Structure 1
Amino acid sequence: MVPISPIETVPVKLKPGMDGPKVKQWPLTEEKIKALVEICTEMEKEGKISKIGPENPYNTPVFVIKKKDSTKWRKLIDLRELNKRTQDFWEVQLGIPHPAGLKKKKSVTVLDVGDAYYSVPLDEDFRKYTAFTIPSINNETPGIRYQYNVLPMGWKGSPAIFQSSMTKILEPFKKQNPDIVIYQYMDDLYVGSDLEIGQHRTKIEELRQHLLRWGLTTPDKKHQKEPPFLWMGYELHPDKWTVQPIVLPEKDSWTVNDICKLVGKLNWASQIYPGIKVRQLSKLLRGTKALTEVIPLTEEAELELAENREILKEPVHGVYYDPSKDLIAEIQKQGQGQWTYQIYQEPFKNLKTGKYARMRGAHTNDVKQLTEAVQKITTESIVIWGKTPKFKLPIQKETWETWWTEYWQATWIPEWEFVNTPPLVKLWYQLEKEPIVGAETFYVDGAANRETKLGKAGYVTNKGRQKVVPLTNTTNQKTELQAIYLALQDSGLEVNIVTNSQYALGIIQAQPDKSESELVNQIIEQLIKKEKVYLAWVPAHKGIGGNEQVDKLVSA
């Protein structure tokens, strides 16, 4: 037994009928070469790595990057070709812990495992496929060939195997210490108890002994006895938390890659900083070719970016979760399909914030978008806290009742109350349920020629009013909308409209207040100005009434 075995390994087959990686090493600069040789030789003394005779016919590239905020270097074996041929795993990391989830604890310890990937044995049979060739200062000296005896960084099975192995080791300690909270994320462990600080450290060291038994070492250097703790990119204080400071690039001239970094930072910021808006900054990224290309900022993306920076000026913080008190989510409409929300328990003390900006559909209204935001908040809350917050919504109780009872789709919002913070969400117009007595009846139709893209839109009415309009570069659908727009333009404040267009009737019955199509927006504009609109549908080509007559006019 030349190399010792420490903890339960995980069987790892190759994908069937496939063989180990072969690919030649990188032209590594000699400066990088120095760092690897010292560490790799050290591994062999521990037993992390073993030398192999050329009987091992596998070569896979290798490279190194400096550890951020450290002088140390990180040793990464590229395994893109080995991943491709290695069996698939099921990832056990189902998400990221959020500090707003955490309950208040009297004593908190954060400890980091050292060489965590290297402390977990790789599968014995699978070890052969690791093989890589070391480099020398010159090309004369060959360099030794090495096979990992433990998990190597850059494999695709490394995270899941480590997380599953780590959980198995922790589980006996957790069962003996039911009242300790251990947040396990990769090798970072967050330990919290209501034990007094002296007793808590006893458990912390006692836990350290337990991890030592399996070869997991927690250095003092990464030990965090004293607040504020640094954990998952947050700063943790006894009663509050915040994101570690975010630096926003100052560039005077913005490329495409610039805006991406900017945007992605602002999304990270919006989890605590209320009211972050990325709409206009993202408008700059639509339909662009080169990540390197330079792009100028519109006066919209500039104003946006201005108030976004000013929100960051003042420090903000979130609080922790009190299972005894209710969860409350409040939502505000920010305009142009932008919504922000705050989740809290004590008024003005936020657990976290967030935004819902997603534009869903070619035609929509605010009530649908509010419903989408409520669902996004509900699922996010269930992940973090396992329950649905009570909702405070800027929509009248009667507005919501009118929408959901009348809509043809099942729709629902969980327990909620009205908050009178403007801008309120409302339905801009309502279609009549029954035909309007004494209102002019417009029979509308339009047709268009598939080849020429030419068409007509027109109407006929019971009073004898008539119109036909020629149109160029159109479609049958567009002319059916146009006919309705014409009837709305040319009618009084109350009007009955009869169409045979299912397309148009479907758009308009869903009461949209915004549309991608300018023509629909204009139809909306008119619907809002009317006092009463009745839309009715008849089947085309059935010899019905006005519909037959207007059909002849537009067909011509």
Structure 2
Amino acid sequence: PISPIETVPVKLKPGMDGPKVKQWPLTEEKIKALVEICTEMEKEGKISKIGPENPYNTPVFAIKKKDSTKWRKLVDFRELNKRTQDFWEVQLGIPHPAGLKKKKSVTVLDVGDAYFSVPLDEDFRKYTAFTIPSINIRYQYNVLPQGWKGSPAIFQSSMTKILEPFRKQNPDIVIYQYMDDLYVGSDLEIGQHRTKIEELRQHLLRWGLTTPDKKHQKEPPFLWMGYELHPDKWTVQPIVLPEKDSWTVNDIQKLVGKLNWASQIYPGIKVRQLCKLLRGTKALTEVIPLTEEAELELAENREILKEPVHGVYYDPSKDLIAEIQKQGQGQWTYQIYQEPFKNLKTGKYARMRGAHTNDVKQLTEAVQKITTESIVIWGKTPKFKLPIQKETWETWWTEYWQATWIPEWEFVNTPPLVKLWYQLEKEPIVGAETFYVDGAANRETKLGKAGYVTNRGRQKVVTLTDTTNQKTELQAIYLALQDSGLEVNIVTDSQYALGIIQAQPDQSESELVNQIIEQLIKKEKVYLAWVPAHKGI
């Protein structure tokens, strides 16, 4: 049924005009069908016939369905959609299951053909013009057309107004619209709930919006993007993996994809060896021999994915707790819960080392990421239980060059704790040897020398083929570190070394830097000093 609701004013992009595309010649049968089908909605007032005063046109084709072999129609608004103005974001994001509260009962009213219930802006209607051909019939839409850019947007806002009165009258009921489905939950006794639903149903019906009967509508458990929603709890569908004989590259990719999604809820899942099977793949359909290391892994994963996972919903009267763990270098797992072991959400992050970082800086980034998603879901930030001592944090952040912070948190002694691998001395070490290191390389020929000379008379130099200046400089520093004992003073003029002094990184992209890092850690005390170049020093 059509409805008596205010149409939303819709216009085409600046300086653009309606569609004017060719109508495909169909069959005597397809034409027959569309003639019948169109005459149907024609009688319903959904569409109206138009004459030659309309120069626009959108292609219309026929398609047989799944349940009836009976024909349905399809209008290709691709072009029109290009020429239509933009509306504000349809849905600014989906509600995550961990941000929902428990409800005694939840029912979803499929307001299916509601797009065709909301009236289209009269003026715009002309652009919807289409044609039913003959072997050897013009119409236009008077209502929101399935497929048109503005339909979902306009339909949503319409549904929003229509529900405002019912919502006010019933502030103890929760409605959530998504597409053409209306989810409604509450904490009322089943009988009372059943009643309100009907009241709502009749409220929408008052606006021509037809809805399915109690006999016919949907019920829980619901499927919500990987989750299986229950009024009491949410559940993750035990992810099924296909055990097969012949594996193709493509197949491995898809597999690694599903596995990666899984790891968020199932820490332990590994794909390191499975990823290796991709190295040098010449075609997407080339078959790959599954290495036994990959067989043991793929197996160990099926076991993990055996045990399902069901969590709990959010209780506003309880505090939020977020706990974090470092599974490896640049790998962190976290779980947010209100009552211990009764998880709301879990996740993990892998951090591609990048230029140069340190574990504490990384922890900081996790905390930051978590804090952001928390605010989106619960509107508040968790109290943090972090595997790091208050002493360590204080020492690091108070000196680090960049502004950084971690909200109210508390140390949790869950090994392995993140700690400062090393700390450069603040002043020169008395007694220790002093290495004046230097390195230079011919930029063009990539030929260089790296070396040092100490206050104890020691010296060394090395010639390097296929090297760069930065490498040479660092190499100079590497050598000094290798040949020095537990305590060392090192002076360099390297601009890049200035970075290490300031950031004191414990991981980097450069394997060379990493070599230096390992060496710095091995030292008992290291004092690094910088001096301008081409001077006396």
* Cα RMSD, aligned residues only: 3.5
- The Cα offsets for residues 460-501 of structure 1, whole Å up to 9 and x where unpaired, read as 221122222222222222222111111111111111111212
Evaluate the alpha carbon distance shift between residue 332 and residue 253 of structure 1 in structure 2; reply closer, same or farther with a 3 A threshold: farther
In the TM superposition, what is the alpha-carbon distance from 1:203 to its structure 2 partner?
A: 1.1
Contact map agreement 1:326 1:389 (CA 8 A) in 2: yes
User: Residues 283-337 of structure 1, C-alpha deviation per residue, up to 9 Å, x if partnerless?
Assistant: 7779988665666666776655444432221111111111111111112222242
- Closer/same/farther in 2, CA of residues 512 and 4 from structure 1, 3 Å limit: same
Q: Distance in 2 between matches of 1:135 and 1:221?
A: 42
- Structure 1 window deviating more from structure 2 (397-406 vs 294-303): it is 294-303
Q: 1:110·1:231 contact (CA, 8 Å) conserved in 2?
A: no
Q: TM-score, normalised by structure 1?
A: 0.85
Q: Does 1:300 align with 2:293?
A: yes
Following TM superposition, by how much is the alpha carbon of 1:44 offset from its aligned partner in structure 2, in angstroms? 2.9
Mapped to 1, the partners of 2:71 and 2:249 lie a distance apart of 30
CA contact (8 A) 2:2 2:208 kept: no
CA separation of 1:125 and 1:308: change in aligned 2, threshold 3 A: farther
Question: Using a 3 Å threshold, how does the CA distance of structure 1 residues 468 and 81 change in structure 2: closer, same or farther?
Answer: farther
Q: CA deviation at 1:66?
A: 9.0
Distance 1:244-1:63 versus aligned 2 partners, 3 A rule: farther
Could you tell me whether the CA contact under 8 Å between 1:76 and 1:152 is conserved in 2? no
Task: State the shift of 1:85 in Å.
Answer: 2.5
Question: C-alpha separation between the residues in 2 aligned to 1:31 and 1:144?
Answer: 15
1:299–1:197 CA distance, 2 compared to 1 (3 A): same
Kept in 1: contact 2:486–2:525 (CA 8 A): yes
Aligned 8 A contact 1:112 1:222 in 2: no
Question: Structure 2 CA distance, aligned partners of 1:334 and 1:67?
Answer: 51
Measure how far apart 1:505 and its partner are: 2.7
Mark the runs of 5 or more structure 1 residues left unpaired by the alignment: 138-142, 545-556
Instruction: Supply the distance in 2 between the matched residues of 1:84 and 1:232 (Cα, whole angstroms).
Output: 29
Structure 1 residue 60 displacement after superposition: 3.7
* 8 Å contact kept, 1:242–1:272: no
**Partner deviation per Cα, 1:395-440 (whole Å, 9 max, x = no partner):** 2222222221221111111111222222221221111111111111
User: 1:309 aligns to what?
Assistant: 302
- Between stretches 155-164 and 430-439, larger displacement belongs to 155-164
Q: 1:527 to 1:209 in 2, by over 3 A?
A: same
Contact 1:110–1:229, Cα closer than 8 Å, also in 2: no
Residue correspondences, number: 537
CA contact (8 A) 2:20 2:58 kept: yes
Q: Which ranges of structure 2 fall in alignment gaps of 5 or more residues? A: none
Q: For 1:78-98, what per-residue CA distance to the aligned partner results, in whole angstroms no more than 9, with x for missing partners?
A: 444333332222204111112
**Kept in 2: contact 1:20–1:58 (CA 8 A):** yes
Whether the aligned pair in 2 keeps the contact of 1:276 and 1:355 (CA below 8 Å) is no
Instruction: Indicate how the Cα distance of structure 1 residues 516 and 6 shifts in structure 2: closer, same or farther if over 3 A, else same.
Output: same
- C-alpha spacing 1:5/1:237, structure 2 compared with 1 (3 Å): closer
2:71 aligns with: 73
SS at 1:75 equivalent = strand
Give the stretch that moved more between structures: 524-533 or 97-106.
97-106
What's the offset of the Cα at 1:518? 1.1
CA distance in structure 2 between the partners assigned to 1:422 and 1:66 by the alignment: 62
Match of 1:38 in 2: 36
Distance 1:146 1:377, change over 3 A: farther
Q: CA deviation at 1:506?
A: 0.7
3-state SS of paired residue (2:467): coil
With over 3 angstroms needed to count, the CA separation of the structure-2 counterparts of 1:403 and 1:103, relative to structure 1, is: same
Contact 1:114 1:216 in 2 (8 A): no
Aligned CA distance change for structure 1 residues 385 and 543 (closer, same or farther; 3 Å):
same
Give CA-to-partner distance per residue, 1:232-253, whole Å, 9 cap, x none.
5532223211134544444544
TM-score computed with the length of structure 2 as normaliser: 0.88
Q: Cα distance 1:485–1:259, how it changes in 2: closer, same or farther (>3 A)?
A: same
Deviation at 1:67, TM superposition (A): 8.7
Gap change, CA 1:29 and 1:542, over 3 Å in 2:
farther
Q: What secondary structure, in the 3-state scheme, does the structure 1 residue paired with 2:352 have?
A: coil
Contact (CA 8 Å) 1:339, 1:356: kept in 2 or not? yes
Structure 1 residues 76 and 376, CA gap change in structure 2 (3 angstroms): farther
